[PDB]
Amino acid sequence: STALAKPQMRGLLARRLRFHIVGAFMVSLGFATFYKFAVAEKRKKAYADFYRNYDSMKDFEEMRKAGIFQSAK
Amino acid sequence: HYEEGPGKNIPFSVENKWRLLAMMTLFFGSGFAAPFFIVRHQLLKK
Amino acid sequence: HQTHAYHMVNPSPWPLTGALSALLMTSGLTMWFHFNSMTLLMIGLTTNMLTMYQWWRDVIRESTFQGHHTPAVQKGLRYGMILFIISEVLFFTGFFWAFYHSSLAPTPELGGCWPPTGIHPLNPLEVPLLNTSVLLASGVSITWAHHSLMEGDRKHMLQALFITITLGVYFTLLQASEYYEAPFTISDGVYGSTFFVATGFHGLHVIIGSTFLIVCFFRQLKFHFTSNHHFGFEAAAWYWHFVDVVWLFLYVSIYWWGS
Amino acid sequence: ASGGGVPTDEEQATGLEREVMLAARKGQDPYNILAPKATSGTKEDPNLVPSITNKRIVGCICEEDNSTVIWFWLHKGEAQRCPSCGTHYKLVPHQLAH
Amino acid sequence: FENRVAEKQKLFQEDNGLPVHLKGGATDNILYRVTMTLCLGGTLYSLYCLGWASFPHK
Amino acid sequence: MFINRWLFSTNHKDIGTLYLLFGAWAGMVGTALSLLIRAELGQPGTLLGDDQIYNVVVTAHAFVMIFFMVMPIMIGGFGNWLVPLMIGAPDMAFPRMNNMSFWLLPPSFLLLLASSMVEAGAGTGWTVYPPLAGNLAHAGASVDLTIFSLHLAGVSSILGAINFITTIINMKPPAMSQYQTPLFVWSVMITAVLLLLSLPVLAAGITMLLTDRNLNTTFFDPAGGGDPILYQHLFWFFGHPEVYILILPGFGMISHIVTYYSGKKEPFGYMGMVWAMMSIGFLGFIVWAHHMFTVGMDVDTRAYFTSATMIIAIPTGVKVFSWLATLHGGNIKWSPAMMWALGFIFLFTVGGLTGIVLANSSLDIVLHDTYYVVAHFHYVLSMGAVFAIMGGFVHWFPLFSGYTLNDTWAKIHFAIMFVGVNMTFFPQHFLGLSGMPRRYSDYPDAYTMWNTISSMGSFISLTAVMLMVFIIWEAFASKREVLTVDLTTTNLEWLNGCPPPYHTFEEPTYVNLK
Amino acid sequence: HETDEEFDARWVTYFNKPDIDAWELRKGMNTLVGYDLVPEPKIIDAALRACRRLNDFASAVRILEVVKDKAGPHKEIYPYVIQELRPTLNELGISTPEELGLDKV
Amino acid sequence: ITAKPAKTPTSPKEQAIGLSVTFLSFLLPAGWVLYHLDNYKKS
Amino acid sequence: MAYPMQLGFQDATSPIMEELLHFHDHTLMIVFLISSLVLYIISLMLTTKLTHTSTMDAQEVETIWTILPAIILILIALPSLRILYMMDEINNPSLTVKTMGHQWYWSYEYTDYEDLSFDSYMIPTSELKPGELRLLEVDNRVVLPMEMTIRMLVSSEDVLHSWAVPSLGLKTDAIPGRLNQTTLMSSRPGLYYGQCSEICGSNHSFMPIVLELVPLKYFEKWSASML
Amino acid sequence: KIKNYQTAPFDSRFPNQNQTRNCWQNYLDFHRCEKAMTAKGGDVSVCEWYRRVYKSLCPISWVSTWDDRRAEGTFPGKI
Amino acid sequence: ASAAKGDHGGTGARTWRFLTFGLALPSVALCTLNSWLHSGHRERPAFIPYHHLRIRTKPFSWGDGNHTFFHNPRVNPLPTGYEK
Amino acid sequence: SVVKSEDYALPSYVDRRDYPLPDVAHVKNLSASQKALKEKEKASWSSLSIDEKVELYRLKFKESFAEMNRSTNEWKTVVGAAMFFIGFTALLLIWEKHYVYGPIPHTFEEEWVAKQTKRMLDMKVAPIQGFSAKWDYDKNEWKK
Amino acid sequence: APDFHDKYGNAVLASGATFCVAVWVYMATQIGIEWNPSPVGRVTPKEWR
Ligand code: HEA
Ligand SMILES: CCCCC/C=C/C/C=C\C/C=C/C/C=C\CCCC(=O)O[C@H](COC(=O)CCCCCCCCCCCCCCCCC)COP(=O)(O)OCCN
Ligand SMILES: CCCCC/C=C/C/C=C\C/C=C\C/C=C\CCCC(=O)O[C@H](COC(=O)CCCCCCCCCCCCCCCCC)COP(=O)(O)OCCN
Ligand SMILES: CCCCCC/C=C\CCCCCCCCCC(=O)O[C@H](COC(=O)CCCCCCCCCCCCCCC)COP(=O)(O)OC[C@@H](O)CO
Ligand SMILES: CCCCCCCCCCO[C@@H]1OC(CO)[C@@H](O[C@H]2O[C@H](CO)[C@@H](O)[C@H](O)[C@@H]2O)[C@@H](O)[C@H]1O
Ligand SMILES: [C-]#N
Ligand code: CUA
Ligand SMILES: [Cu+2]
Ligand SMILES: [Mg+2]
Ligand code: NA
Ligand SMILES: [Zn+2]
Which cellular component appears as one GO term in the record (chain C)? Predict the structure, then answer.
């Protein structure tokens, strides 16, 4: 036989809201970070790596040899 | 002056559920079937 | 029995006859344009006239004869008229927009200039100026009509209203002769197109406005208007000022600036 | 310059238009054109709500500028209270036509 | 002209249960039937015209 | 009796009921047309073997859904039944003109069906751009019949808009200001001001098209000094307000449904919701040329239309967050109407956010005239309007009929519809980003996968529509009559009973000024 | 607005009014459960005594049910409140919903 | 909302009939046109 | 061209297309955020028995949810407008090619020096050579020199059409009586496909665009041989 | 002769997307020039720059239509 | 502006009639003179078959299909020139 | 007990978590014993039995909080039935495939596709990320 | 007293799911639909010229 303490009784809904809006925000910043990493930076690097030593005459000659052009056999 | 109340404020009868079924079938059914028939008509024209 | 002041209207056939008349006139114009026949059109024009005649007859019955136009009813009618005229102003606006678009940037087909090569505009100082003085005058004589009616003066109401309608009719005959005399037609490129379709919708409104004033003339003759309750006359005066203002914009834009 | 010949509303208004005009001249409002002014709304001084029947819908705007209107049937008999603010209303039935 | 508004008012307020569009008497009924016959007749004619125009007249 | 009541009506409730029947019937037509579209596209190759017929189907699908299903239901249907009730008015201001707005619609629909039956149809797009819609590329009566159909539907909505404005301004209780009318009445008033101003501009532009086709005018024909682009400005100057016209009464109903099933007496931020609908209405007249970014437009005009277009998201998001804030702390009731309103909030957000991608004229150069645009508007507009209409319809069916629906069947229907519409339109984003044009009867083989899924989704929504019909049959077949409805104290339209009598507010409400 | 203490004190006074009628009792409880809080024991104690003065046993039990409901998933609140009220419950002969079998579905 | 029990209850069997009839009214006519589309195209 | 199951844009062929992909990535991040934040806040509102149904004060939370959106739109508009104006910047083309829309095929005119013009029609499916692309191939391709600034001018001789090549970020409507300009620069050789992008009637779906990008010297001999 | 033309350069009088007036102005200039020359006893070759520019810009069908209309007496611009 | 006159005590019937006869109808009589003076037929210009004028993309739905609705033989040439 | 439609304009009884004290008692007519119970209730509640307390509750109110808030198995019927109609949709799609659609173009045949795929690699379709980027031009196979 | 859901709930759920998965699997794999999946990792490129 012990008494129960007095729990918080006031502003329960507002407390739940405060708590989770902060979590909603953090999901967003830790996701922003992810999207910026798996998609956006991945793209800049794909393009940058592709073009760094890209040789367009060499690319053309391989296409020309493959027979793909009307204007160049 | 007019009938008032559930089932009386409408241009169609709901006195019998089967007659109602038939009418609703024709009413929504004609709307739905019309574009198929218009396309059939235009195909058959040439 | 109601204890508000609003009007509950007797069930009426005119909405349906008006709707069918719109279908006949549109079907009709189609038949005329494509199947060389005027029959549908003639029928929808006839039923349309009959619908307007009876529907407005009934409004006169409901008001002068039966007393349903309380202040609250009359106030709604004043909103409805104003809204109506707004919608007509937006309608002319799309024709003004067409005019300015084509005249501000004339394409090479026209000669690259406005008026186009080969178009000889009317002199805006001849019959168009006359038309302008006619419509402006009729806005002064209708305001005299309006004050006479409010001052209780029947004879001067009828006289000023008569002068107003004679000026509308003079405008319409002057315009019909201008149309006949013009060396350019509706088929003369976008100059003809914009000229005729804009001034032509304006002329139709002058005919409608004139008809509305003639309706008010006959009702006045029949003593329907009181010195304080005469919404039909107000509405026709508002619509009349609308037709005058549209003319002033046509005059300044098409006849003067576009010349 | 002038003359007469144009009827007045006093002469020629008829039906409900005439009725409203005649009542207005007596300061009365049988067609509900004006908004009623509130009493203090207590038990002892309730808002008095005329009706030609034994119930009438009341809309209570509890505080000035509320956008929410509180709606309820007021029935003949004891004063009722607005379920949002408690202000008191009492129905006062019957007549309008002699 | 004389003001015969009061007569018209007496006629259109007569307690006979008639709708306003028919309350002027027998002529209203005629004009009504002419209007409605032309409208319903013209509409059936437009349906006829549609049927005819729906097919090539080669 | 029948003819007096139903052909000669001067009653707002019965004319609202006729609009709902008319709009439900149009809906079955526009639905069949959309399933013909998706069947053509459901596998690579040709189904109809006739691409003029495909283009006529696409065109009719849009005009029917927009002019005959959505506008009649929202404004004629819910606006007639609910607006006079919600302000305690005895009817519309012009109850007899109201009946002609209704009856103009069957003739306008008949003209539309006539244009598809004569010649080869109008295969123009619902935008009806010349010269394709002119008398050389579309010779004969079909496009004129379409134009006349629009003229009648235009007259019907313009006289409707005059009726609603006047009714809402002039017929409230003497004590009720404008800032005391429910948000649905605000949404109808704003919609009507836009109808009033925009439809006469369409009427002027399609009239010019009619005279170019039949009186040798050359407004849009460069051989007479005309310009096809001028028609596009006239059309979109109406067409943008038109899109807000189609959704604003939906936002009005949404606000009432969210408030009601949250157990709340009022929406959150009422004056913010008013402000948002007014700002959207105002700004809806200055963004139209974002429909024309590939026409050959100067750059500064492009920068301005991109920016004015973005600014509209601001008032639109206030409304989304205010619906969330209305739900917040609610005693949430999971009725079928609440599910429709929640599905609305989610679909509308998705579609408004692809709108934001599109606002960027530089990205729109590549997305314009592709399925990315079809995906935008079937989310924000199409499903947004349909979900609000289904929400409103389930919520207020017992009010209009005096009978209840089966809530379980109605939950089932929502669920099927939500899967169908997402399976139909989500894949079209992929099709549009990868470059599939819109208005196509067939596609390069790479696009097969998403087309196939999209066409299959379309049949799932068919099944939901057939179920909807049976659900409405079941309610009228069983006749469970309504006894009690909660929250009448802040939902005046329910307070005269279910259904309410033919004449309500014969004695007006009593409201004190104080 | 006001402190928690002033809010609670105003509610206490509301329900302590000796001649509170049945209408006021309902208006006060139905307004109060709109707030984001479970009412302090001293507010519920005043409402319960108002039930006594109005000879309404059933409403006292209903008041206990709605306290429990206002706590949502905070299962510690209701047992604490009942603990705090137990002298008043004893004094007035009010059985709890659980003692009545009225917590069973 | 509360309501009375149905005045004319519609049993599971009657539901099954109203539902089948409703689905057939949409399916058969369109099914018939689509099934014969070849016949239209070359005719 | 697009490939099976593609989710996003075709890979960029020009620096301007590449810019647009990075700008779409920025935008769609934001789009994702917002939509997720929303779906989420919503499920939050809907998953508690706790209630609070009395009047709530709005003018405060309205600040956040008007200002935050305005900020976000500015974070989209800034790079949006920079791209818009960058693409509008003067560039000095070495070549102008006209294309004219027709029902249903494209004609091309290269008249800086000689009168070279020809018509470009879709290859019918039954005439495709093995390994060619249904609806995409043409008899005569638009040969152009790679790595050079080209001015395209676009018009029509009948109804509207629209000349599009998604991998280059290009779409310019083809309007009769009007001459619309766009510039094109391919960083690579190869074959680049688009499709008519304004509804122009029965065969809107079947008048594609195929660009053939090769070294200048091959373009010049191809030109000479097409006279 | 101060030439060496690849294509028509940027013309700040016609900087935007619609190049119709660029084409038309050059077509006019060329023919105005050729008229001023072939009249007053001089050389059409001073007109060559406008000829090159309108040829580069203008659709063949426009040039062709405008040439027919000058022959017919129905060309609406002032030369 | 304030025009160049006076009255303004009240704007009544007498004032508006004074304006109708003293200002408005006299303007109309002045304009009618200035018109029925500059009227008399002007010399019709040489016919040139400009392709932006006399448009015919569809026959008009009256007459022989080639005459405008208010065709004036004197001053409206057909696509092939003025009539006989 | 019995509620009537023609009572719509009168305060009514409701069970709602958020409106605990509704505007009228659930039972308003009392039998002789129910009237003696209401009398008894004017005296100390300690002298009421448990049964009598319950009976007083059930006179004032229809359902308890626990009764009115109980969860249900309805979701199973909703999710099962929706999957049933979705499954039924597949049957329409099987029918449409069997009777409406003919053969799709020859460009989807396996050998056509292999040749097209080589050509797309030869022309280096989407060489940065989308397509050819995924082919190994050295090892002559798809990147693992 | 058990309602419709208590009595049929479990069976509606189970067979609804079973039925839906079976028929969509059949439609997807057994009747000749060409989904046109990526060749990547699945098609061996073949000489076309
Ligand atoms: C319901 C009708 C509706 C609505 C509401 C919208 C809303 C918007 N539309 Fe759309 N739109 C169409 C119907 C609609 N549209 C139609 C039918 C078409 C094409 C028609 C055709 O060609 O046939 C179309 C086409 C269209 C185009 C032309 C694409 C093209 O053809 O190339 C463009 C581009 O600017 C556009 C942009 C937008 C935007 C920015 C909104 C906004 O008003 C959306 C704003 C809403 C949100 C953004 C979600 C809510 C907000 C938040 C959660 C707050 C915070 C948000 C941010 C900070 C971004 N739309
Ligand atoms: C092809 C041609 C076609 C023309 C088209 C027609 C349209 C016009 C319409 C109709 C106009 C008809 C006029 C009616 C005339 C008589 C109405 C009878 C009423 C009357 O007699 O009004 C009198 C004035 O009338 C009057 O001079 C009437 C005077 C008319 C004035 C106009 C004439 C111009 C006068 C020349 C002077 C010009 C110099 C002007 C310089 C200054 C201007 C700024 C005032 O008298 P009273 O004592 O106050 O009356 C009390 C009870 N009636
Ligand atoms: C006398 C001045 C007042 C003008 C009224 C004149 C009467 C003729 C008929 C009614 C016209 C009124 C509406 C305006 C419509 C278009 C053209 C009207 C202007 C006009 O009358 O133009 C005439 C051409 O008429 C033509 O083609 C006429 C072709 C007549 C058929 C008109 C076609 C009607 C189609 C209109 C559909 C309107 C849709 C509007 C809907 C409202 C929005 C819902 C000009 O004659 P012209 O020989 O070319 O040139 C003169 C050279 N001597
Ligand atoms: C050859 C001619 C054919 C042309 C076709 C169309 C032409 C004719 C239309 C001309 C308009 C006639 C309108 C007459 C309306 C008479 C009814 C009337 O005027 O009704 C009044 C109410 O106003 C009311 O409804 C006001 C109602 C306003 C209607 C005005 C509408 C203008 C109509 C335009 C229609 C075409 C639109 C434009 C097309 C591009 C009655 O109230 P009071 O006057 O206060 O009287 C009561 C007092 O007596 C009591 O003491
Ligand atoms: C876009 C939405 C469309 C949804 C898909 C509709 C799917 C279910 C449709 C069922 O419809 C029918 O089925 C037939 C066969 O299954 C048809 O009979 C045809 O087939 C026969 C046998 O193959 C013959 O017995 C007949 O004479 C006959 O014409 C045909 O009439 C039709 O009504
Ligand atoms: C946006 N339309
Ligand atoms: Cu050419 Cu579409
Ligand atoms: Cu828009
Ligand atoms: Mg386009
Ligand atoms: Na196809
Ligand atoms: Zn109150």
Answer: mitochondrion
